[PDB]
Design a protein around this ligand. Structure first.
Ligand SMILES: CCCCCCCCCCCCCCCCCC(=O)OC[C@H](COP(=O)([O-])OCC(O)COP(=O)([O-])OC[C@@H](COC(=O)CCCCCCCCCCCCCCCCC)OC(=O)CCCCCCCCCCCCCCCCC)OC(=O)CCCCCCCCCCCCCCCCC
Ligand SMILES: CCCCCCCCCCCCCCCCCC(=O)OC[C@H](COP(=O)([O-])OCC[N+](C)(C)C)OC(=O)CCCCCCCCCCCCCCCCC
Ligand SMILES: CCCCCCCCCCCCCCCCCC(=O)OC[C@H](COP(=O)([O-])OCC[N+](C)(C)C)OC(=O)CCCCCCCCCCCCCCCCC
Ligand SMILES: CCCCCCCCCCCCCCCCCC(=O)OC[C@H](COP(=O)([O-])OCC[N+](C)(C)C)OC(=O)CCCCCCCCCCCCCCCCC
Ligand SMILES: CCCCCCCCCCCCCCCCCC(=O)OC[C@H](COP(=O)(O)OCCN)OC(=O)CCCCCCCCCCCCCCCCC
Ligand SMILES: CCCCCCCCCCCCCCCCCC(=O)OC[C@H](COP(=O)(O)OCCN)OC(=O)CCCCCCCCCCCCCCCCC
Ligand SMILES: CCCCCCCCCCCCCCCCCC(=O)OC[C@H](COP(=O)(O)OCCN)OC(=O)CCCCCCCCCCCCCCCCC
Ligand SMILES: CCCCCCCCCCCCCCCCCC(=O)OC[C@H](COP(=O)(O)OCCN)OC(=O)CCCCCCCCCCCCCCCCC
Ligand SMILES: CCCCCCCCCCCCCCCCCC(=O)OC[C@H](COP(=O)(O)OCCN)OC(=O)CCCCCCCCCCCCCCCCC
Lengths: 105, 70, 347, 98, 80, 167, 110, 96, 313, 114
């Protein structure tokens, strides 16, 4: 049983640590505040059975914000192709990716 | 008498004087005649790396003032 | 033990279970389980003999391993969901680990290997606390994560608990090991209907707590810890034999008694869901529980085993033990089946 | 996911299988349990710092304190067993077979 | 109520000092006039950027320049 | 080599666990868990959790493992151990060789083979540490958490003094 | 990086001085001899009291681990709550010491 | 003495924070141009590396949404030398 | 350049530990109406050198140890932790200017009991093991008041930065608002490093089973900890004037104060009889710890009632 | 999904404020006094659009108005300001509290001449 005493008595014992989108000290945002805000505002009140299949896009964007699976897979792809082209001698790294260009600011 | 102990205390005091004096000299030597930049917080490191990028010699301790802008 | 310290420690056990029940954060679930274990350790070492220290060591090792698996499941949920809400789990690895951890806390088979040992090592009031109050927290956590539980894992745990708790009590003469294998079988019954209708899980939990509390309260009132010590009760106080008769015929699921109320309703919620084979195996396996219950009724109520001479002295003194709620528990654990549609209050 | 999480999870499983396969002593079991706790601490800390989720920075300390209190309780049990048989051997704890 | 106090100050002066310091530490923040200024300083320390507002037209209490008169003032902190 | 440094520390971490999960003796096991705590502190410190790594030193190693070694020194005074050690080390090196020759692996979850420097943030947190402020919020926001932790520690004192009494 | 260089230098100097101190008089040849303690061969009696002071240290050290973010927590804006919970943690540490006192737990190591 | 001097230290801290607040729009604008510079350079090098790969879309986002996502460390420094990577990803942590 | 900075830290540490033995024997000489060593060098200045060259060619004791590895690693950990306590000390500028240098020093001084524990377990004598367990229980006892006094003091600092603790004390020594914490701090640092009247490892000590070389290494780690804790007490209560353009004013000033405080250790070991073991456990758990909790509550609630909360930065 | 939209390298070119951090921190309060409006339009645009790509043009106004801030120092009070930011630049934490009289000379020259 989930005796919801916190909603009954109106006290906030531990809802504050529950999500990243909650209120943080000195307004420090989490790295996936916008993604989790979109996922929670999608999935609020519609129940979990509708929320697993009607908020799939928001939750997959939020999960890939969390773990960065697709991003690191894409960086593996680009770095692997780059190293293959350097090994074949068909590509050269540019001056700004060799560290010789007096950075912007 | 009691002043015989002062040579040993003086040698121990010189050995305690060496590390701080030497690290002050080394900090003034490695940083353009100035103190070492204290970066405990992320904003201080961002300003320090911005100094390193605008100095043009990849040393943060080369201070560019009004002679650099037009 | 100081009575003030005993009150504070039992309030700490109850506060740990309440923190598991009322909180919306996984760290507070874990804190409640840690507090519950930390406070129930002196209830087991109340009498300070080597068997209670061995039972407390086995309980510590199993519940600590379970709490560490529980925290690993919480942490993988934090990986794959970024949030701490006590609801469904967002990874089948976290779901498997949390169901394993709660199985180790409930003593469901094949993680049951601490329950007949620890209950044998500790007193009867502490065994009452272990077999009744310590089931309320993990069944609540299982109640709240049931959209994430794999059906195959929880049903394997359920039927394996029913069969092992059935075959376990057939070889036992110690009353505490009989009640412990009875515990394992009834936990299998509670978790088998959990993903189909968890209201029947709460119903079986309440009826089980009433029947186990009745039997441990009768054992405490009569100071009987083995079968043969329970056999002397007809010569000391005969009404207790009638009460253990009606309570053990209740716990075996025999109608018209109220221990038939859970499992019938459990069958009533599993034949809805196209499952005929599994509640049939469950019902047929429950006859083993009913067999060793009938063994205890043959030794206690339906025959008269020979007593000793010194029992004649114990006729001259009344029972002064505070048999708290024993007539209320004995009425509620037997005569409650005509009130079977009261179960909707658990919805 | 990240590469360091593989090593911290494999560390947790190594300390688990050490805790799930006793050799002789109860102290070695408690040490494997606290290695499990240490790996959970490191893993929770890397997630909470990685995501910049601010309020859960007080989470691993809690995960320390309770579990360390747990270890204290375990050490007490070990001592009581070692006051009965002279050693902390887990093969002395076999009275509850009967 | 006082003979006991001289008794415990003779026998255990460390515990009398301990409970006196702990008693002052509990009751005395409720009695000081300066406990308000702790909060009034700790909210007036700007760790964040004071993100400006879109001027709709009805904000007479919000300035349009930092040196405007209206807005929160920290002259109480300079003066005290 | 240096861009993998956190990874490298984690390797030593796992090596240290095979140091004591193999359980050679509880005292060498305590030493292995001390070395593991040191390198896991290094893992935490290389993300910016300075306070949490110093809690690994001050409270875990210097506070609790002291009590483990202290109790062990007053309560205790093969080939299975060596085989367990080499088996765990070889499984770890096979994992390292796989994820370094493929840059991707899947034991139970999918794991990238790149350095874990890639997943960081490219911003600054101003005149605080985010981790120090999240721990400072234990007293302002975390009231209930402080209540249950202080009650569990008081009850921990009570429970230890009850069960170590023997009466 | 400068810290790791400093730690490695200090550990290297420590290891080098330990290697000197164990191996510089191994160049000496001096002799050999037999060389066979208040207790002779009796095993160490377990003193319960040293274990009690160790566990009491551990519990108060966990309470100190809770108390450590107070210099950072004094900067908060919820100062009445912060002051209440700070004084409450130090009061529960005092209650732990009072219970450790009055149950004779601090005895013969008072 | 500590009352007067800690009040003075709070006034000096507020002065330094107001200096930072006056500087933050310039540093924010320079940071925006910095990260857009690095992403444009990485995009052009991705377009000239990922040509042989069949079915490759250069600059395809891994997110379904069209919202700006804050670029990861490996998205900016994924194609640079190891010194710039180490200096940018462990510079503040390893600074003394 | 930085390796030069590390060596100019740690070599004069070892030389100051060397001449601390001469200063100790001379000051304990004159406080006992006699002279200390003055034959060997001119006024005795070659006594630590003669002592070291004697000890490093003494025969090893060649013992049977229960463990080779911990018998080796106890002086290694001793010298390593005794030398790395020096690196965050702002004097006027630290070697490693870290944000949590106070917490670093507290954690590394908490790790030093493993040298006592391992070097007592490595000796085969069980009575030596009893001495090691008593010394470890003493040290971990007084670490409690180290931590709580340190926290109660740094509530007036604002952060765990050691270098900010100079900026704190530009107007007053921090021994004026916190002298009871100061005097309990001084006794607690006196009881950490096994210094009289708390040296119960003189009476069997834990390291009576080592050779003369490794005993000299344990001894010099002990004295490095003595000079270090006196410098730490100097920075933390008796903080000096700091000119950013002439740092040697701060260096000479904290040097003179740290020498007077180390001489005060020497002047305390020649003045009092030793505590019995339960009497210093009574000193900690029943005298220092209630006052330390009371003054901790007072220094929590005191910047709030005075509106004198220090800045974080 | 979609191709990400990034502006060109010609869109990102602007005359940089190539001064150090102490040169900025020395003139920080007069910058916040005098360069209020483009900085606040930029940070309002930056917190509302939540996208740097929508805040390029306003960002250039920031980099347009800071330089006009410094030229007007370089025309009139280059010597008191150089004497002031050098003293700010010596300190490791870059304190204001160590440099109050060069601050008084610089603020005197700014208040008179500008
Ligand atoms: C809602 C759920 C409530 C659950 C039950 C709560 C109370 C019981 C649990 C606590 C406990 O042990 O209390 C002692 C307990 C008796 O336990 P015991 O020692 O085993 O009783 C044996 C003899 O009664 C001992 O007799 P005695 O001679 O020592 O003393 C005479 C005593 C004297 O009584 C008094 O002095 C009472 C006056 C003080 C009351 C409090 C004032 C403040 O009178 C009685 O005990 C008469 C019997 C009382 C009823 C016991 C059972 C209560 C109902 C249980 C739940 C029923 C649910 C049915 C559902 C069916 C469908 C599913 O209760 C009382 O003494 C008073 C009960 C009051 C009931 C109020 C019901 C309405 C509440 C609204
Ligand atoms: C910096 C701190 C101080 C560091 C240590 C002191 C600095 C000097 C170190 C070397 C001192 C001399 C060698 C050790 C002492 C030798 C004493 C001795 O009895 O030697 C005889 C021994 C052997 O003499 P033996 O062959 O007659 O053996 C005597 C034993 N019987 C009779 C039973 C066989 O000499 C040695 O072992 C030689 C050691 C090296 C000599 C110096 C080499 C160059 C060093 C520069
Ligand atoms: C015994 C416990 C004594 C202290 C209880 C908390 C006192 C207090 O000021 O609480 C306000 C605080 C905080 O209130 P608040 O006013 O700061 O809340 C504003 C919201 N934030 C913090 C985000 C700005 O706690 C609560 O209101 C709820 C938590 C405590 C509830 C009571 C627990 C009782 C347990 C009994 C067993
Ligand atoms: C850090 C800079 C230097 C510091 C000072 C260095 C110089 C001084 C060194 C002196 C020599 C020390 C050698 C070792 C001494 C060991 C003995 C020892 O310490 O015993 C401790 C003794 C122990 O007591 P005892 O054992 O002597 O007495 C008997 C005690 N019973 C009954 C329990 C057996 O005293 C203390 O613990 C006192 C600690 C400090 C107390 C500070 C009190 C501050 C004032 C509080 C308020 C009082 C007013 C009332 C309330 C007002 C409210 C408005
Ligand atoms: C959705 C669910 C939410 C939760 C709902 C409520 C769940 C209630 C679960 C009840 C579990 C009871 C646990 C055990 C009792 C707790 C109090 C206790 O510790 O009692 C033991 C006590 C010890 O006495 P002692 O002296 O130590 O015994 C040795 C001999 N001298 O005293 C004794 O030993 C005295 C002997 C008799 C004790 C009888 C106690 C009976 C309590 C249970 C009543 C039945 C359950 C309540 C109704 C159903 C609720 C589901
Ligand atoms: C299959 C399940 C195990 C998977 C990992 C296997 C690792 C290699 C060990 C194989 C078994 C070796 C063995 O004999 O184990 C038994 C031993 C306890 O037995 P003991 O009393 O020491 O010796 C008498 C014989 N049993 O038990 C132990 O000592 C177990 C220690 C286990 C620590 C795990 C270390 C890491 C292993 C790889 C990752 C998992
Ligand atoms: C940071 C500061 C650290 C300071 C550390 C050092 C403190 C002590 C400083 C030195 C004190 C004075 C030393 C005097 C040594 C004795 C001199 C002497 O006259 O020795 C006589 C001896 C035998 O001479 P003989 O030929 O027999 O005489 C017959 C005459 N008809 O002749 C001999 O024995 C031969 C000569 C031996 C000389 C030894 C000198 C001492 C060496 C100490 C090592 C450290 C030196 C300083 C290092 C730091 C500075 C570089
Ligand atoms: C028996 C074995 C042998 C025994 C002898 C040798 C071992 C014991 C003695 C050495 C102990 C090592 C302690 C290392 C960590 C100390 C804590 C620490 O690093 O704190 C300093 C600092 C935090 O301060 P902060 O200013 O916040 O961070 C910089 C950002 N401004 O943080 C930083 O600056 C972080 C710097 C980068 C990360 C450095 C990580 C180094 C590797 C970890 C420890 C390796 C040793 C492992 C074994 C230890 C055994 C206990
Ligand atoms: C409300 C604010 C918060 C209060 C709590 C915070 C406390 C902070 C300090 C931590 C103290 C922790 C440990 C306290 C233990 C107390 C129990 C005790 O020590 O009792 C025994 C003692 C006699 O000692 P004995 O047992 O003989 O020991 C042998 C050698 N002494 O017995 C005694 O010495 C008698 C002790 C009781 C009488 C003391 C009276 C003190 C009066 C101080 C001024 C008024 C304070 C008002 C506050 C409320 C007091 C109730």
């Amino acid at each position: 049983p989930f005796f919801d005493v916190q909603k009954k008595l109106g006290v906030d014992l531990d809802h504050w640590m529950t999500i990243q989108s909650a209120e943080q000290p000195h307004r420090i945002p989490a790295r996936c505040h916008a993604f989790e805000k979109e996922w929670i505002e999608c999935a609020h009140g519609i129940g979990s059975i509708r929320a697993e299949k009607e908020c799939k896009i928001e939750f997959e964007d939020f999960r890939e914000c969390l773990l960065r699976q697709k991003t690191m897979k894409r960086l593996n792809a680009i770095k692997r192709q780059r190293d293959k082209l350097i090994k074949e001698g068909k590509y050269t790294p540019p001056p700004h990716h060799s560290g010789q260009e007096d950075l912007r600011p | 008498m009691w002043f015989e102990v002062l040579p040993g205390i003086a040698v121990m005091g010189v050995c305690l004087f060496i590390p701080g004096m030497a690290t002050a000299r080394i900090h003034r030597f490695s940083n353009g005649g100035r103190e070492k930049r204290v970066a405990h917080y992320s904003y201080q490191w961002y300003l320090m790396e911005r100094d390193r990028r605008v100095s043009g010699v990849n040393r943060y301790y080369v201070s560019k003032g009004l002679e650099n802008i037009d | 033990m100081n009575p003030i310290i005993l009150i504070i420690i039992l309030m700490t056990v109850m506060l740990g279970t309440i923190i598991v029940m009322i909180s919306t954060h996984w760290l507070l679930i874990w804190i409640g389980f840690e507090m519950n274990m930390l406070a129930i350790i002196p209830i087991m070492m109340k009498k300070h003999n080597p068997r209670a220290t061995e039972a407390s060591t086995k309980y510590f090792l199993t519940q600590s391993t379970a709490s560490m698996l529980l925290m690993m499941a919480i942490i993988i949920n934090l990986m794959f969901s970024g949030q701490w809400t006590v609801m469904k789990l967002f990874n089948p690895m976290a779901s498997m680990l949390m169901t394993m951890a709660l199985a180790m806390k409930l003593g469901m088979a094949p993680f049951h290997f601490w329950v007949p040992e620890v209950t044998q090592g500790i007193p009867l009031s502490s065994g009452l606390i272990l077999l009744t109050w310590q089931k309320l927290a993990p069944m609540s956590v299982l109640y709240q994560i049931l959209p994430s539980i794999n059906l195959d894992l929880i049903l394997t745990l359920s039927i394996l608990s029913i069969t092992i708790g059935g075959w376990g009590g057939l070889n036992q003469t110690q009353l505490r090991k009989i009640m412990a294998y009875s515990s394992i079988a009834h936990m299998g019954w509670m978790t088998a209907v959990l993903l189909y209708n968890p209201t029947m899980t709460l119903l079986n939990l309440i009826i089980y707590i009433i029947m186990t509390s009745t039997m441990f309260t009768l054992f405490m009132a009569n100071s009987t810890t083995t079968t043969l010590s329970l056999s002397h009760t007809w010569n000391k106080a005969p009404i207790m034999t009638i009460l253990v008769l009606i309570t053990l015929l209740s716990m075996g699921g025999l109608p018209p008694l109220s221990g038939f109320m859970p499992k019938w309703m459990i069958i009533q919620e599993m034949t809805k869901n196209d499952s005929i084979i599994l509640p049939t195996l469950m019902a047929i396996t429950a006859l083993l529980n009913l067999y060793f219950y009938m063994r205890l009724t043959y030794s206690t109520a339906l025959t008269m085993f020979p007593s000793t001479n010194n029992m004649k002295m114990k006729w001259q003194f009344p029972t002064t033990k505070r048999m708290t709620l024993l007539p209320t528990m004995t009425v509620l654990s037997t005569m409650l089946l005509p009130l079977t549609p009261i179960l909707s209050i658990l919805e | 996911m990240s590469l360091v999480y593989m090593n911290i999870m494999m560390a947790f499983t190594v300390s688990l299988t050490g805790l799930l396969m006793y050799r002789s002593h109860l102290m070695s079991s408690l040490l494997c349990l606290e290695g499990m706790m240490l790996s959970l601490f490191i893993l929770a800390t890397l997630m909470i710092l990685n995501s910049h989720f601010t309020l859960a920075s007080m989470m691993p300390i809690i995960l320390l304190v309770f579990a360390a209190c747990e270890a204290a309780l375990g050490l007490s049990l070990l001592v009581m067993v070692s006051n009965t048989y002279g050693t902390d051997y887990v093969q002395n704890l076999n009275l509850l077979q009967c | 109520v006082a003979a006991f106090l001289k008794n415990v100050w003779a026998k255990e002066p460390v515990l009398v000092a301990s409970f006196a310091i702990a008693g002052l530490a509990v009751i005395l923040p409720t009695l000081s006039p300066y406990t308000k200024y702790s909060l009034m300083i700790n909210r007036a320390t700007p760790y964040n950027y004071p993100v400006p507002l879109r001027d709709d037209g009805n904000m007479p209490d919000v300035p349009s320049h930092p040196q405007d008169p209206q807005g929160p003032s920290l002259e109480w902190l300079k003066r005290l | 080599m240096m861009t993998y440094i956190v990874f490298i520390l984690s390797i030593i971490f796992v090596m240290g666990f095979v140091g004591f999960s193999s359980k050679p003796s509880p005292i060498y096991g305590g030493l292995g868990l001390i070395v593991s705590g040191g390198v896991g502190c290094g893992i935490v410190l290389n993300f910016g959790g300075s306070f949490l790594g110093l809690m690994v030193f001050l409270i875990y190693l210097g506070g609790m493992m002291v009590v483990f070694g202290y109790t062990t020194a007053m309560a205790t005074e093969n080939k299975v151990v060596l085989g367990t050690f080499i088996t765990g080390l070889l499984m770890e090196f096979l994992m390292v060789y796989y994820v370094l020759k493929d840059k991707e692996v899947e034991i139970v979850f999918k794991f990238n083979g790149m350095g874990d420097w890639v997943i960081y943030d490219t911003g600054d947190s101003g005149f605080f540490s985010e981790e120090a402020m999240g721990i400072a919020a234990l007293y302002s926001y975390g009231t209930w958490l402080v209540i249950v932790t202080g009650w569990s520690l008081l009850i921990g004192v009570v429970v230890i003094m009850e069960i170590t009494r023997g009466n | 990086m400068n810290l790791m260089i400093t730690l490695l230098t200090n550990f290297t100097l420590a290891t080098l001085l330990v290697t000197i101190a164990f191996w510089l008089p191994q160049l000496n040849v001096y002799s050999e001899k037999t060389s066979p303690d208040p207790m002779g061969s009796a095993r160490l009696p377990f003193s319960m009291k040293f274990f009690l002071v160790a566990i009491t240290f551990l519990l108060f050290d966990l309470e100190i681990a809770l108390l450590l973010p107070l210099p950072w927590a004094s900067q908060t804006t919820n100062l009445n709550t912060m002051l209440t919970m700070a004084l409450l943690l130090i009061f529960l540490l005092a209650v732990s010491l009072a219970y450790e006192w009055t149950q004779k737990g601090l005895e013969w190591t008072e | 003495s500590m009352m007067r001097w800690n009040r003075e230290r709070r006034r000096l801290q507020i002065e330094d924070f107001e200096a930072r607040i006056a500087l933050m729009p310039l540093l924010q604008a320079e940071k925006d141009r910095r990260v857009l510079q690095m992403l444009r350079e990485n995009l052009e090098e991705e377009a000239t590396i990922m040509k042989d790969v069949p079915g490759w879309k250069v600059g395809e986002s891994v997110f379904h949404t069209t919202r700006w996502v804050t670029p990861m460390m490996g998205e900016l420094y994924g194609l640079r030398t190891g010194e710039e990577i180490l200096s940018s990803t462990y510079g503040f942590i390893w600074y003394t | 350049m930085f390796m030069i900075n590390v060596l100019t830290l740690i070599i004069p540490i070892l030389l100051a530990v060397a001449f601390l033995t001469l200063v100790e024997r001379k000051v304990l000489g004159y406080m006992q109406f006699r002279k200390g060593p003055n034959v060997v060098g001119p006024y005795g200045l070659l006594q630590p050198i003669a002592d070291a060259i004697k000890l490093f060619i003494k025969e090893p004791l060649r013992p049977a140890t229960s463990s080779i590895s911990m018998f080796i690693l106890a002086p290694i950990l001793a010298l390593t932790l005794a030398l790395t306590m020096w690196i965050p000390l702002p004097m006027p500028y630290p070697l490693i200017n870290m944000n949590l240098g106070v917490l670093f020093m507290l954690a590394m001084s908490s790790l030093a009991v493993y040298s006592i524990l391992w070097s007592g377990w490595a000796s085969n004598s069980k009575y030596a093991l009893i001495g090691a367990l008593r010394a470890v229980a003493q040290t971990i006892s007084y670490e409690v008041t180290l931590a709580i006094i340190l926290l109660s003091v740094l509530l007036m600092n604002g952060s765990f930065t050691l270098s900010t603790l100079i900026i704190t004390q530009e107007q007053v020594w921090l021994i004026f608002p916190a002298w009871p914490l100061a005097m309990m701090w001084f006794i607690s640092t006196l009881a950490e490093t096994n210094r009289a009247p708390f040296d119960l490892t003189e009476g069997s000590g834990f390291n009576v089973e080592y050779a003369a070389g490794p005993f000299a290494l344990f001894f010099m780690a002990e004295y490095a900890n003595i000079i270090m804790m006196n410098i730490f007490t100097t920075t933390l209560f008796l903080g000096a004037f700091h000119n950013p353009y002439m740092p040697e004013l701060y260096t000479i000033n904290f040097t003179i104060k740290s020498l007077l405080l180390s001489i005060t250790f020497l002047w305390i070991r020649a003045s009092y009889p030793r505590f019995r073991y339960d009497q210093l456990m009574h000193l900690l758990w029943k005298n220092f710890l209630p006052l330390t909790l009371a003054l901790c509550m007072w220094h929590v609630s005191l910047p709030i009632l005075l509106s004198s909360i220090p800045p974080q930065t | 999904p979609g191709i990400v939209e990034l502006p060109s390298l010609e869109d990102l070119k602007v005359q940089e404020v190539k001064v150090s951090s102490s040169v900025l921190k020395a003139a920080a309060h007069h910058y916040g006094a005098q360069c209020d409006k483009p900085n606040k339009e930029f940070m309002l645009c930056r917190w509302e659009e939540k996208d740097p790509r929508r805040c390029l043009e306003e960002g250039k106004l920031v980099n347009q108005c800071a330089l006009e801030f410094f030229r007007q120092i370089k025309r009139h009070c280059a010597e008191p300001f150089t004497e002031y930011w050098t003293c700010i630049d010596y300190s490791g934490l870059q304190l204001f509290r160590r440099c109050r009289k060069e601050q008084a000379q610089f603020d005197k020259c700014v208040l008179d001449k500008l």
